[PDB]
Amino acid sequence: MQTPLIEAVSSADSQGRFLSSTELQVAFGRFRQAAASLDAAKTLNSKADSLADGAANAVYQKFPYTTQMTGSNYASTPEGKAKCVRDIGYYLRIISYCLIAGGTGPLDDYLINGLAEINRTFDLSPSWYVEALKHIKANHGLSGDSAVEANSYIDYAINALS
């Protein structure tokens, strides 16, 4: 699962060689950002339930048919809304993992790879999750480079859905 560190080892290993000064400098780079990103992941944890509801509410506003039309794939029921907020909690949790890992690896392995197949088979619209992500982006309440990173992960997820 791709992080700056694993990318370097995978390059070195595919060429049968020991790590280079450059791959060592990759690690310094990763370690220079790490602590502010780790902090960002902690604040996302303390606001997760709050963000997830807020996001799911923002989806029900933008797409009112999702609250009213009956059928498995909609939030017209207690169970439908609970599925929806769950899915939003997954995007949020998996995004916090990207802050921990210093790259998109958790996003690729846990969510993005197969996403189209999931959304098609279960009749879930990608645009729904795009709105939820937009809400998360505007309310996480992060600042500094933590925000710029978190937002890169959110943008990367929106782009996979589009």
């Binding site: 699962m1 694993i6 080892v9 790590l19 370690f31 780790l38 949790r93």
Partner: protein, 172 residues
């Protein structure tokens, strides 16, 4: 493979949980010590041929039958293959030190190796002794106090040691 950070992530994801504040602080602590980590990788990497050469010398002094005729490191082809294995194991160890996780070493080097050696007739016990000699040479080099900013690398050297010991247990 996993690195120290994705190792923590994967254990959390399995429980459906965010990484705890404690686990985050444990990783921060590892981030604070990371120059030392990268020195060890650098020093072992840059002295690789010396660590292999000296460990091989010490192994054969201890076990001279390995390279007497009929021994499994006798003949240049088998001696070279033996030195090559020592280098390969040292290389995977440096990868585990850099990532801060054993998975690269387990997945790409140690898994299936015991079985490979028995099918070949290579004495796994003696490979394990060779790995231990590399451990000693490698830690002396990594923990040398000359030409480096002074401080405590005790936990890091224990970690390096545990990767060499994992290699010894996988084949011994």
């Amino acid at each position: 493979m996993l690195d120290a950070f994705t190792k923590v992530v994967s254990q959390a994801d399995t429980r459906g949980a965010y990484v705890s504040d404690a686990e985050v602080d444990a990783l921060k602590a590892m981030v604070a010590d990371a120059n030392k980590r990268i020195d060890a990788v650098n020093r072992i990497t840059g002295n690789a041929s010396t660590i292999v050469a000296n460990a091989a010398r010490a192994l054969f002094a201890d076990q001279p039958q390995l390279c007497a005729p009929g021994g499994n490191a006798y003949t240049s082809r088998r001696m070279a293959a033996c030195l090559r294995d020592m280098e390969i194991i040292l290389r995977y160890v440096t990868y585990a030190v850099y990532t801060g996780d054993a998975s690269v070493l387990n997945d790409r080097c140690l898994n299936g190796l015991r079985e490979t050696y028995s099918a070949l007739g290579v004495p796994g016990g003696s490979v394990a002794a060779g790995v231990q000699k590399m451990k000693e040479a490698a830690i002396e080099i990594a923990n040398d106090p000359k030409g480096i900013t002074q401080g405590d690398c005790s936990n890091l050297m224990a970690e390096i040691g545990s990767y060499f010991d994992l290699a010894s247990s996988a084949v011994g």
